[PDB]
Coordinates of C-alpha atoms and ligand atoms in Angstrom, one line a residue:
Chain A
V1 CA -58.9 -154.8 -111.4
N2 CA -58.7 -152.5 -108.4
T3 CA -57.8 -155.2 -105.8
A4 CA -55.3 -156.8 -108.2
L5 CA -53.6 -153.4 -108.9
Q6 CA -53.6 -152.7 -105.1
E7 CA -51.8 -156.0 -104.4
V8 CA -49.4 -155.2 -107.2
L9 CA -48.7 -151.9 -105.4
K10 CA -48.3 -153.9 -102.1
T11 CA -45.9 -156.4 -103.6
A12 CA -43.8 -153.7 -105.3
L13 CA -43.7 -151.8 -102.0
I14 CA -42.4 -155.0 -100.4
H15 CA -39.9 -155.7 -103.2
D16 CA -38.9 -151.9 -103.2
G17 CA -39.2 -151.9 -107.0
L18 CA -41.7 -149.1 -107.4
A19 CA -40.6 -145.4 -107.6
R20 CA -43.2 -143.5 -105.6
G21 CA -43.5 -139.8 -106.4
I22 CA -43.3 -137.4 -109.3
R23 CA -39.7 -136.2 -110.0
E24 CA -38.4 -139.8 -109.8
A25 CA -41.4 -140.7 -111.9
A26 CA -40.1 -138.3 -114.5
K27 CA -36.6 -139.9 -114.0
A28 CA -38.2 -143.3 -114.8
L29 CA -39.9 -141.8 -117.8
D30 CA -36.6 -140.5 -119.1
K31 CA -35.0 -143.9 -118.4
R32 CA -38.2 -145.4 -120.1
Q33 CA -39.1 -147.3 -117.0
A34 CA -42.9 -146.5 -117.0
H35 CA -45.2 -149.5 -117.6
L36 CA -48.1 -149.0 -115.1
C37 CA -49.0 -145.8 -113.2
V38 CA -52.1 -144.6 -111.4
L39 CA -53.4 -141.4 -113.0
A40 CA -55.4 -138.8 -111.1
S41 CA -58.7 -137.4 -112.5
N42 CA -61.4 -134.8 -112.0
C43 CA -59.6 -133.2 -109.0
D44 CA -59.0 -129.5 -108.0
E45 CA -55.7 -129.1 -109.8
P46 CA -55.2 -125.5 -111.1
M47 CA -52.3 -126.1 -113.6
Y48 CA -51.6 -129.8 -113.1
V49 CA -54.1 -131.7 -115.2
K50 CA -52.6 -130.9 -118.6
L51 CA -49.1 -131.8 -117.4
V52 CA -50.2 -135.0 -115.7
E53 CA -52.0 -136.1 -118.8
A54 CA -48.9 -135.2 -120.8
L55 CA -46.7 -137.4 -118.5
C56 CA -49.2 -140.2 -118.5
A57 CA -49.4 -140.0 -122.3
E58 CA -45.6 -140.1 -122.9
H59 CA -44.3 -143.6 -123.7
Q60 CA -46.4 -146.8 -123.5
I61 CA -48.0 -146.2 -120.1
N62 CA -51.2 -147.8 -119.0
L63 CA -54.5 -145.8 -118.9
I64 CA -55.2 -146.6 -115.2
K65 CA -57.3 -143.9 -113.5
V66 CA -58.2 -143.2 -109.9
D67 CA -61.1 -141.1 -108.6
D68 CA -59.2 -139.0 -106.1
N69 CA -55.6 -138.1 -105.1
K70 CA -55.7 -138.3 -101.2
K71 CA -56.5 -142.0 -101.1
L72 CA -53.7 -143.1 -103.5
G73 CA -50.9 -142.3 -101.1
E74 CA -52.6 -144.1 -98.1
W75 CA -51.5 -147.4 -99.6
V76 CA -48.0 -146.1 -100.5
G77 CA -47.1 -145.1 -97.0
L78 CA -46.3 -141.4 -97.4
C79 CA -46.9 -140.5 -93.7
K80 CA -48.0 -144.0 -92.5
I81 CA -46.6 -143.9 -89.0
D82 CA -48.3 -146.4 -86.6
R83 CA -48.3 -149.3 -89.0
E84 CA -50.8 -151.3 -86.9
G85 CA -53.5 -148.7 -87.8
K86 CA -54.4 -145.2 -89.0
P87 CA -51.9 -142.3 -88.6
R88 CA -52.8 -138.9 -87.1
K89 CA -51.1 -136.9 -89.9
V90 CA -51.1 -137.8 -93.6
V91 CA -50.8 -135.9 -96.9
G92 CA -52.1 -137.5 -100.2
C93 CA -50.2 -138.4 -103.4
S94 CA -50.4 -137.5 -107.0
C95 CA -48.5 -140.1 -109.0
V96 CA -46.9 -143.5 -108.4
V97 CA -45.1 -145.7 -110.9
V98 CA -44.2 -149.4 -110.5
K99 CA -41.3 -151.5 -111.7
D100 CA -42.7 -155.0 -111.0
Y101 CA -39.6 -157.2 -110.8
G102 CA -41.9 -159.9 -109.2
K103 CA -44.4 -159.2 -112.0
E104 CA -45.7 -162.8 -112.2
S105 CA -48.8 -163.3 -110.1
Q106 CA -52.2 -165.0 -110.2
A107 CA -54.2 -161.9 -111.4
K108 CA -51.4 -160.3 -113.5
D109 CA -52.5 -162.3 -116.6
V110 CA -56.0 -161.2 -116.1
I111 CA -54.8 -157.6 -115.7
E112 CA -52.7 -157.6 -118.9
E113 CA -55.5 -159.3 -120.9
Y114 CA -57.8 -156.6 -119.6
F115 CA -55.4 -153.9 -120.8
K116 CA -54.3 -155.4 -124.1
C117 CA -57.7 -156.4 -125.4
Chain B
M1 CA -29.7 -139.6 -89.5
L2 CA -27.8 -138.8 -92.7
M3 CA -27.6 -142.3 -94.2
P4 CA -28.8 -143.9 -97.5
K5 CA -31.4 -146.6 -97.7
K6 CA -29.1 -149.2 -99.2
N7 CA -26.7 -149.0 -96.3
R8 CA -29.4 -150.0 -93.7
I9 CA -30.5 -152.9 -96.0
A10 CA -27.0 -154.2 -96.4
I11 CA -26.3 -153.9 -92.7
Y12 CA -29.5 -155.7 -91.8
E13 CA -28.7 -158.5 -94.3
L14 CA -25.2 -158.7 -92.8
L15 CA -26.8 -159.2 -89.4
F16 CA -29.0 -161.9 -90.9
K17 CA -26.2 -164.1 -92.3
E18 CA -24.1 -163.6 -89.1
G19 CA -26.1 -162.9 -86.0
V20 CA -23.5 -160.8 -84.1
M21 CA -21.5 -158.0 -85.8
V22 CA -18.2 -156.7 -84.6
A23 CA -17.0 -153.0 -85.0
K24 CA -14.1 -150.9 -84.0
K25 CA -15.0 -147.7 -82.1
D26 CA -13.1 -145.0 -84.0
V27 CA -14.5 -142.2 -86.1
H28 CA -11.1 -141.7 -87.9
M29 CA -11.7 -144.9 -89.9
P30 CA -14.1 -144.7 -92.9
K31 CA -12.7 -147.8 -94.7
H32 CA -14.8 -150.6 -93.1
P33 CA -12.8 -153.8 -92.9
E34 CA -15.7 -156.2 -92.1
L35 CA -17.9 -154.9 -94.9
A36 CA -15.3 -154.3 -97.7
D37 CA -17.6 -154.9 -100.7
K38 CA -19.2 -151.4 -100.1
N39 CA -17.5 -148.3 -98.8
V40 CA -19.1 -147.2 -95.6
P41 CA -17.9 -145.1 -92.7
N42 CA -18.0 -146.8 -89.3
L43 CA -19.3 -143.7 -87.6
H44 CA -22.7 -144.0 -89.3
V45 CA -22.8 -147.7 -88.7
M46 CA -22.3 -147.2 -85.0
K47 CA -24.9 -144.4 -85.1
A48 CA -27.5 -146.7 -86.6
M49 CA -26.6 -149.4 -84.1
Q50 CA -27.0 -147.1 -81.1
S51 CA -30.3 -146.1 -82.7
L52 CA -31.3 -149.7 -82.7
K53 CA -30.1 -150.1 -79.1
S54 CA -32.4 -147.2 -78.1
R55 CA -35.2 -149.0 -80.0
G56 CA -34.5 -152.1 -77.8
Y57 CA -34.3 -155.0 -80.2
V58 CA -30.6 -156.1 -79.7
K59 CA -28.2 -156.4 -76.8
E60 CA -25.0 -154.4 -76.2
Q61 CA -21.5 -155.6 -75.2
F62 CA -18.0 -154.0 -75.0
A63 CA -14.5 -155.5 -75.4
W64 CA -12.1 -152.4 -75.4
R65 CA -13.2 -151.3 -78.9
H66 CA -15.5 -154.1 -79.8
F67 CA -19.2 -153.6 -79.8
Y68 CA -21.1 -156.9 -79.8
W69 CA -24.8 -156.9 -80.7
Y70 CA -26.6 -159.9 -79.5
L71 CA -30.0 -160.2 -81.2
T72 CA -33.2 -161.4 -79.7
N73 CA -36.0 -163.4 -81.4
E74 CA -38.5 -160.5 -81.2
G75 CA -35.7 -158.5 -82.7
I76 CA -35.5 -161.1 -85.4
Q77 CA -39.2 -160.5 -86.0
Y78 CA -38.7 -156.7 -86.1
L79 CA -35.8 -156.9 -88.6
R80 CA -37.5 -159.5 -90.8
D81 CA -40.5 -157.1 -90.8
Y82 CA -38.2 -154.3 -91.8
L83 CA -36.8 -156.3 -94.8
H84 CA -40.4 -157.8 -95.3
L85 CA -38.9 -161.3 -95.7
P86 CA -40.7 -164.5 -94.8
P87 CA -39.3 -166.3 -91.7
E88 CA -38.6 -169.5 -93.7
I89 CA -34.8 -169.1 -93.5
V90 CA -33.5 -169.6 -90.0
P91 CA -30.4 -167.7 -88.8
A92 CA -27.1 -169.4 -89.6
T93 CA -26.1 -169.1 -85.9
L94 CA -29.3 -171.1 -85.1
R95 CA -28.2 -173.7 -87.7
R96 CA -26.1 -176.3 -85.7
Chain C
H1 CA 16.9 -184.9 -98.5
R2 CA 17.8 -183.5 -95.1
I3 CA 15.1 -182.5 -92.6
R4 CA 15.0 -180.9 -89.1
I5 CA 12.5 -180.2 -86.3
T6 CA 12.5 -177.0 -84.2
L7 CA 11.0 -177.0 -80.8
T8 CA 10.4 -173.7 -78.9
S9 CA 9.1 -173.9 -75.3
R10 CA 8.0 -171.5 -72.7
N11 CA 8.8 -174.0 -69.9
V12 CA 12.0 -176.1 -69.5
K13 CA 11.1 -179.5 -68.0
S14 CA 8.3 -180.1 -70.6
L15 CA 11.0 -179.3 -73.3
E16 CA 13.5 -181.8 -71.7
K17 CA 10.8 -184.5 -71.3
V18 CA 9.4 -184.1 -74.9
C19 CA 12.9 -184.0 -76.4
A20 CA 14.0 -187.1 -74.4
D21 CA 10.8 -189.0 -75.4
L22 CA 11.4 -188.1 -79.0
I23 CA 15.1 -189.3 -78.7
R24 CA 13.6 -192.5 -77.2
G25 CA 11.3 -192.8 -80.2
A26 CA 14.2 -192.2 -82.6
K27 CA 16.1 -194.9 -80.8
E28 CA 13.2 -197.4 -80.7
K29 CA 13.0 -197.0 -84.5
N30 CA 16.8 -197.5 -84.4
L31 CA 17.9 -194.8 -86.8
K32 CA 21.2 -192.9 -87.0
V33 CA 20.3 -189.4 -85.8
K34 CA 22.2 -186.2 -84.8
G35 CA 21.3 -185.4 -81.2
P36 CA 19.7 -182.3 -79.8
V37 CA 21.6 -179.1 -79.6
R38 CA 20.9 -176.9 -76.5
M39 CA 20.3 -173.5 -78.0
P40 CA 20.6 -170.6 -75.4
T41 CA 17.6 -169.2 -73.7
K42 CA 16.8 -165.6 -74.0
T43 CA 16.7 -163.5 -70.8
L44 CA 13.9 -161.0 -71.5
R45 CA 14.2 -157.5 -70.0
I46 CA 11.1 -155.4 -69.3
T47 CA 11.4 -152.7 -66.7
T48 CA 8.4 -150.5 -65.8
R49 CA 7.4 -148.2 -63.0
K50 CA 5.0 -149.6 -60.3
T51 CA 3.8 -146.0 -59.5
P52 CA 0.7 -144.8 -61.5
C53 CA 1.7 -141.2 -60.7
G54 CA 4.7 -139.3 -59.4
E55 CA 5.3 -139.2 -55.7
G56 CA 8.1 -140.3 -53.4
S57 CA 10.9 -142.8 -54.0
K58 CA 11.1 -144.3 -57.4
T59 CA 10.9 -148.1 -57.2
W60 CA 11.1 -150.2 -60.4
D61 CA 10.4 -153.8 -61.3
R62 CA 12.3 -156.3 -63.5
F63 CA 10.0 -158.4 -65.5
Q64 CA 11.5 -161.5 -67.2
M65 CA 10.1 -164.0 -69.7
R66 CA 11.6 -167.5 -70.3
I67 CA 11.8 -168.9 -73.8
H68 CA 13.7 -172.1 -74.6
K69 CA 14.3 -173.2 -78.2
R70 CA 15.9 -176.4 -79.6
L71 CA 16.7 -177.9 -83.0
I72 CA 16.9 -181.6 -83.7
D73 CA 18.2 -182.9 -87.0
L74 CA 16.5 -185.9 -88.6
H75 CA 17.6 -188.3 -91.4
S76 CA 14.5 -190.5 -91.4
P77 CA 11.9 -190.4 -94.1
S78 CA 9.3 -187.6 -93.6
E79 CA 6.1 -189.6 -93.2
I80 CA 7.3 -191.3 -90.0
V81 CA 8.3 -187.8 -88.7
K82 CA 4.8 -186.6 -89.5
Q83 CA 3.3 -189.6 -87.7
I84 CA 5.4 -189.1 -84.6
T85 CA 4.8 -185.3 -84.6
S86 CA 1.0 -185.8 -84.9
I87 CA 1.0 -187.6 -81.5
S88 CA 2.2 -186.4 -78.0
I89 CA 1.0 -182.8 -78.5
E90 CA 0.9 -180.2 -75.8
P91 CA -0.7 -176.7 -75.3
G92 CA 2.1 -174.1 -75.3
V93 CA 4.6 -175.3 -77.8
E94 CA 4.1 -174.5 -81.5
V95 CA 6.1 -177.2 -83.4
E96 CA 7.9 -176.6 -86.6
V97 CA 9.0 -178.8 -89.5
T98 CA 12.2 -177.3 -90.8
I99 CA 12.8 -178.1 -94.5
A100 CA 15.9 -177.0 -96.5
Chain D
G1 CA -16.8 -131.3 -98.1
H2 CA -16.3 -132.7 -94.6
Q3 CA -15.3 -136.1 -96.0
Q4 CA -12.1 -134.5 -97.2
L5 CA -11.9 -132.0 -94.4
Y6 CA -12.1 -134.8 -91.9
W7 CA -8.7 -136.4 -92.9
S8 CA -7.1 -132.9 -93.2
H9 CA -4.5 -134.0 -90.6
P10 CA -2.8 -137.2 -91.9
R11 CA -2.0 -139.9 -89.4
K12 CA 1.3 -141.6 -90.4
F13 CA 3.7 -141.1 -87.5
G14 CA 3.9 -139.6 -84.0
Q15 CA 1.9 -140.5 -81.0
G16 CA -1.3 -139.2 -82.7
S17 CA -1.5 -142.3 -84.9
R18 CA -0.5 -144.8 -82.1
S19 CA -2.5 -145.6 -79.0
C20 CA -3.0 -148.4 -76.5
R21 CA -4.3 -151.8 -77.3
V22 CA -6.3 -152.1 -74.0
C23 CA -7.5 -148.7 -72.8
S24 CA -6.6 -146.4 -75.8
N25 CA -4.4 -143.7 -74.2
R26 CA -1.5 -141.7 -75.6
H27 CA 1.0 -141.6 -72.7
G28 CA 3.8 -144.0 -71.8
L29 CA 3.3 -146.6 -74.6
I30 CA 5.3 -149.8 -74.7
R31 CA 7.1 -150.2 -78.0
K32 CA 8.8 -153.4 -76.9
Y33 CA 7.9 -156.1 -79.4
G34 CA 4.8 -154.3 -80.5
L35 CA 2.9 -154.6 -77.3
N36 CA 1.4 -151.0 -77.8
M37 CA 0.2 -150.9 -74.2
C38 CA 0.6 -148.3 -71.5
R39 CA 2.4 -149.1 -68.3
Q40 CA -0.5 -149.8 -65.9
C41 CA -2.6 -152.0 -68.3
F42 CA 0.5 -154.0 -68.9
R43 CA 0.9 -154.2 -65.2
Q44 CA -2.5 -155.6 -64.6
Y45 CA -2.3 -157.8 -67.7
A46 CA 1.2 -159.0 -67.0
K47 CA 0.0 -162.0 -64.8
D48 CA -2.0 -163.6 -67.6
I49 CA 0.5 -163.3 -70.5
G50 CA 2.7 -166.1 -69.1
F51 CA 5.1 -164.3 -66.7
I52 CA 7.0 -165.0 -63.5
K53 CA 9.1 -162.3 -61.8
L54 CA 12.6 -163.7 -61.1
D55 CA 15.3 -161.0 -60.7
Chain E
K1 CA -25.5 -121.1 -74.4
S2 CA -25.3 -118.0 -76.5
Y3 CA -22.2 -116.2 -77.9
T4 CA -21.7 -112.5 -78.2
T5 CA -20.5 -113.1 -81.8
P6 CA -23.4 -113.3 -84.3
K7 CA -24.2 -116.5 -86.1
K8 CA -24.4 -117.3 -89.8
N9 CA -27.0 -120.0 -90.8
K10 CA -26.8 -123.1 -93.0
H11 CA -28.4 -123.6 -96.4
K12 CA -31.9 -124.7 -95.4
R13 CA -34.3 -125.5 -98.3
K14 CA -37.4 -123.2 -97.7
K15 CA -41.0 -123.8 -98.6
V16 CA -41.0 -123.9 -102.4
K17 CA -44.1 -124.8 -104.4
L18 CA -44.3 -125.7 -108.1
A19 CA -40.6 -125.9 -109.1
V20 CA -40.1 -129.2 -111.0
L21 CA -43.0 -128.3 -113.3
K22 CA -40.8 -125.5 -114.4
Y23 CA -38.8 -128.2 -116.2
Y24 CA -41.9 -129.2 -118.1
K25 CA -43.5 -126.2 -119.9
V26 CA -47.1 -126.6 -120.9
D27 CA -47.0 -126.6 -124.7
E28 CA -49.7 -126.8 -127.4
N29 CA -49.6 -130.4 -128.7
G30 CA -47.8 -133.6 -127.6
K31 CA -44.2 -132.5 -127.9
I32 CA -41.9 -133.5 -125.1
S33 CA -40.1 -130.3 -124.4
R34 CA -37.1 -129.1 -122.4
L35 CA -36.2 -125.5 -121.4
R36 CA -32.9 -126.1 -119.6
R37 CA -30.1 -128.5 -120.4
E38 CA -29.2 -132.0 -119.2
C39 CA -26.0 -134.1 -119.0
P40 CA -24.7 -135.2 -122.4
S41 CA -22.4 -137.4 -120.3
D42 CA -23.4 -140.4 -118.2
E43 CA -21.6 -139.9 -114.8
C44 CA -24.7 -137.9 -114.0
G45 CA -27.9 -139.8 -114.8
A46 CA -30.4 -138.8 -117.5
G47 CA -32.9 -137.7 -114.8
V48 CA -30.4 -135.1 -113.5
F49 CA -31.2 -131.6 -114.6
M50 CA -29.0 -128.5 -115.0
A51 CA -29.3 -125.3 -113.1
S52 CA -30.3 -122.0 -114.6
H53 CA -27.6 -119.5 -113.6
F54 CA -26.6 -116.2 -115.3
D55 CA -24.3 -117.6 -117.9
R56 CA -23.7 -121.3 -117.2
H57 CA -25.3 -124.7 -116.2
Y58 CA -24.2 -126.7 -113.2
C59 CA -24.5 -130.5 -112.9
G60 CA -25.9 -132.1 -109.7
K61 CA -22.9 -134.3 -109.0
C62 CA -20.3 -134.1 -111.8
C63 CA -19.7 -130.3 -111.3
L64 CA -18.8 -129.9 -115.0
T65 CA -19.6 -126.3 -115.8
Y66 CA -20.1 -125.2 -119.4
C67 CA -20.5 -121.5 -119.9
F68 CA -21.7 -119.7 -123.0
Ligands
LIG201 ZN1 -23.3 -134.8 -114.8

């Protein structure tokens, strides 16, 4: 499930369909364009856990969780200078939402049957 | 570089369909004739193109106003990496 | 019903030779034709200053262009005129098919 | 608001809207037949526009 | 290099933390709330939010100001 969701993130980054971030995530929530997102959990968030569970539990959004925040934005490319390898300066993410225009893939049927069952 | 993301994408796709772009060097002209489907000032187009010249993926030529950008094959690789498109489609200039 | 051909030339001897050869074509097809009319040439007047800046005696130059135009009337059907116009072309004369 | 402050001087007439078609200057333009050239660029481009000096 | 006249700056956005969460107040149960206004019109998008001034709300692009 994790590798398939990562390649969905990569293909949506290639297609420029995803809306990386949080304000534009709320924009997609208000436009009702939230189908899959990666939700942070058990992190050191002082007044953010209640609001992030509120925005994840808003309108037909997947219950996809991640262990930590700093490794979610490494795939997104928040400060990913020097594309051939690892950057010398990077800040992690909190939330990413995807709008898979190229939704159809080999593992997408497995992912939706995992979620819907 | 005060330019939107769609403007670079459309300019790069315009450079894919025709390999060399023409432009008139004047800042007092924001109604671009050669790209008329979208409103775009020519000043920011020439700023992005001199940025790409300082990158070093495309040539430079002058005919009294007329900046001619001759693209290289490694420049084709860099631009197709920027759009993240497969190299299956050849340039139309390369099509005989 | 009536047709006409207009021939504007930069040169003069090319104009005379092309018009004479088209008269010879109109006579080898043996058709009653109004002959060419020698329209006047235009004496072009451009006068500039040779000096880039201002110093000394002011010496000018007289620059002239030569343009020579003709009209020839035709009474022949138009397709033969198209066929004789599509052959014997030359770089420098933009031909016309006057219709009225 | 510099998009509407940029065209705060309209260009419709005068020598501010007209310039050379070769070297882009605003002195001594040729308005004969819409050449829109200055004198010296016309002088160095007079040989290749089909010209002989006669009188 | 420098002028004897003083210089006035330009509107630079400073280091601001926890601002957009001010548009989502933490309530008791699962009620989607809103403390400030939005566009009733559509020339500004639904994700565009109003300002909180002394007596009026200002739209991001449309500049349609409605006072109280
Ligand atoms: Zn609005």
